RNA sequence: GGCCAGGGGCGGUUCGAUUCCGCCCCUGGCC
């Protein structure tokens, strides 16, 4: 009922970037972002008022959050990246990439209308990650990781210029100059991706990791060791679909494998790494070798003593990553399936 | 909104087991 309010109070609001992208790409979203060419707080305040919902206004920020059902909506006054009015375009030009710099009017006057100045819709059509201007990567070197994320997650490719700049930025050292926190969280974001591996491939292609993770350096075993896990993760997800896991961290572990900074747990520390992870990590050094090596002697029944390690699945997955004892574990899951169904 | 965790819940893997996970709920932390 925002189109109405905005009118009552002679304002212009629009949903923006992030969400508009997914929309075009036909993807349901519960997090919606708005940009008001006036005072967002008031808009948000009256909005909740009319819905009888609580509001969290953040003055000085010119922002306010509220929730209607499972709808998490955020209103923000137009700006220039934190004075004066500032038009939508101005707020929209300080954005990520063209596919993320589009807006849709929720103004009754011209409702539903898609607003794109930078040809984001085209880039979205031609599958392209393109920045708004030359200094883009310099202004915020986190966008590097972002660029790759989307490129990886959407199977989009970087424009000639964008790739050219992106490369400049990396060898210009900016990755080692950005607010670690931003970079860190950005990676956790990618880490959550389902096409995370394909994202990781791009990290290789531009030597990004070699700058963020200190003791890191790419080696072919690990690479195909990654794809190998891809195979497990895929099938497993199909069968033992009953119980899954944030497969993403498994990949990271393998990358972390061949540890660096004194068993670089310090990285898993920066990373808001879950329990099973910070755990399944320590178990690598102690049993990745023994478990496997000592496993080579079994008839049956000692499957039962290894079943105690599944206390946190993952490991059960990092084993198939060694051909020899692959089908062994493949039959385990099926095996126990005969014990529960005598 | 992710995770520390300090106290619940409706479902579970087992024969249980507040030790195992799904999540939700609450209490104080970090991005
Ligand atoms: N450094 C940055 N530069 C430009 N835009 C940024 C930015 N950081 C955040 N944004 C903007 O903030 C929004 C990020 O919010 P999210 O809800 O996580 C959506 P997203 O990152 O666009 O896509 P997602 O649904 O895959 O997460 C985007 O709409 C984006 O334009």
- Nucleotides of chain B within 7 Å of a protein C-beta? 1-5, 13-15, 20-22, 30-31
Instruction: Please enumerate, by residue number, every residue of A annotated as part of a binding site for ATP.
Output: 18-21, 95-96, 100, 140-149, 153, 182
Q: How far apart are CA A224 and CA A147, in angstroms?
A: 24
Which of A's residues 221-280 have CB atoms within 7 A of nucleic strand B?
243, 245, 272-276
The class of domain A1-125 in CATH terms is alpha beta
* Domain residue limits, chain A: 1-125, 126-342
Structure tokens at A109: 């006057």
CA A290 to chain centre: 34
* HSE-up of residue A207 (Cα within 13 Å, Cβ side): 12
- Nearest one of A294, A298, A302, A268 to A282, comparing CA atoms: A268
CB A282 within 8 A of CB A259: no
Resolution (angstroms) equals 2.8
Task: Give the rounded distance of the alpha carbon of A70 from its chain centre.
Answer: 21
Beta partners for residue A75, in sequence order: A34, A64
Q: What are the helix (H) ranges across chain A?
A: 2-8, 18-24, 40-51, 88-93, 120-125, 136-139, 143-154, 160-170, 180-192, 196-205, 209-212, 220-239, 247-256, 265-270, 275-283, 290-295, 303-306, 314-319, 326-339
Ligand 1, atom 25, residue with closest C-alpha: A18
Residues near ligand 1 (Cβ within 6 A): A 17-18, 22, 31, 33, 95-96, 100, 140, 142-143
CA angle A139, A141, A147 (to 5 degrees): 110
For residue A67, what are the β-bridge partners?
A: A72
Matching fold, domains A1-125 and A126-342: no
A310 touches strand B (CB under 7 A): no
Angle A234-A238-A240 from CA coordinates, rounded to 5°: 110
Could you tell me which residues come within 8 angstroms of residue A200 by beta carbon, excluding any fewer than 6 positions away? A152, A190, A226, A251, A255
How many residues does the structure list for chain A?
A: 342
Q: How far apart are CA A150 and CA A261, in angstroms?
A: 30
The method recorded for this entry reads: X-ray
Element (H or E) spanning A236, and its range? Answer: helix A220-239
- Element (H or E) spanning A180, and its range? helix A180-192
Please give the biggest Cα pair distance in chain A: 79
CA distance A310 to A174: 42
Residue the block writes with tokens 């400049």: A168
Q: DSSP H helical segments within A52-179, as ranges? A: 88-93, 120-125, 136-139, 143-154, 160-170
Closest CA relative to residue A143, chosen from A191, A193, A96, A102: A96
> How far apart, in whole angstroms, are the C-alpha atoms of residue A293 and residue A315?
14
Rounded CA-CA distance A210/A153 in Å is 21
Q: Which CATH superfamily is domain A126-342 in?
A: cca-adding enzyme, domain 2 (1.10.3090.10)
Atom of ligand 1 nearest to the CA of A182: 1
Q: How far is the CA of A192 from the centre of ligand 1 (A)?
A: 15
Q: Ligand 1 centre and the CA of A19: distance in Å?
A: 9
A289 touches strand B (CB under 7 A): no
DSSP code of residue A284? I
Residues A48 and A66: beta-carbon distance below 8 Å: yes
Residue A37's closest CA among A99, A103, A100? A103
What's the rounded Cα separation, in Å, for the pair A209 and A191?
A: 13
- Per DSSP, chain A holds a count of helices (H) and strands (E) of 19, 9
CA of A324 to C1' of B13 (A): 28
Atom 6 (ligand 1): residue with closest C-alpha? A96
Query: Of A257, A267, A263, A273, which Cα lies nearest the Cα of A318?
Result: A257
Residue nearest to atom 21 of ligand 1 (CA): A18
- A45, with CB counted inside 10 A (0-12, 13-18, 19+), is middle
Distances (CA, A) of A320 to A86, A100, A323: 57, 40, 6
Token look-up 């004194």 returns: A262
């Amino acid at each position: 009922m925002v189109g109405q309010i905005a009118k009552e109070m002679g304002l212009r609001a629009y949903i923006v970037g992030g969400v508009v992208r997914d929309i075009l790409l036909g993807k349901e979203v519960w997090d919606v972002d708005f940009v008001v060419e006036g005072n967002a707080i008031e808009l948000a305040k009256e909005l909740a008022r009319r819905h009888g919902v609580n509001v969290h206004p953040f003055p000085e920020f010119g922002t306010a959050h509220l929730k209607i059902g499972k709808l998490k909506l955020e209103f923000a006054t137009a700006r220039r990246e934190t004075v004066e009015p500032a038009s939508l375009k101005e707020d929209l030009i300080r954005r990520d990439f063209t596919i993320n710099a589009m807006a849709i009017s929720v103004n009754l006057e011209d409702y539903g209308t898609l607003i794109d100045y930078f040809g984001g819709l085209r880039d979205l059509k031609d599958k392209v990650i393109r920045v708004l201007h030359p200094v883009s990567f310099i202004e915020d070197p986190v966008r590097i990781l972002r660029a790759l994320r989307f490129a990886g997650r959407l199977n989009f490719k970087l424009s000639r210029s964008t790739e050219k700049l992106l490369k400049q930025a990396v060898n210009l050292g900016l990755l080692k100059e950005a607010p670690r926190g931003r970079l860190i969280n950005e990676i956790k974001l990618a880490l959550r991706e389902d096409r995370f591996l394909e994202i990781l491939e791009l990290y290789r292609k531009y030597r990004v990791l070699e700058e963020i993770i200190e003791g890191f350096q790419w080696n072919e075993k690990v690479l195909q060791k990654l794809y190998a896990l891809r195979k497990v993760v895929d099938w497993h997800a199909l069968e033992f679909s009953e119980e899954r896991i944030d497969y993403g961290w498994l990949y990271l572990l393998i990358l972390i494998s061949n540890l660096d900074y004194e068993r670089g747990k310090h990285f898993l520390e920066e990373m808001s790494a879950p329990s099973w992870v910070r755990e399944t990590y320590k178990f690598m050094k102690f049993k990745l070798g023994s478990l496997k090596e000592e496993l080579k002697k079994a008839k049956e029944n000692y499957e039962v003593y290894r079943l105690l390690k599944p206390l946190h699945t993952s490991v059960l997955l990092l084993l198939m990553l060694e051909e020899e004892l692959k089908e062994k574990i493949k039959l385990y899951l099926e095996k126990l399936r005969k014990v529960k169904l005598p």
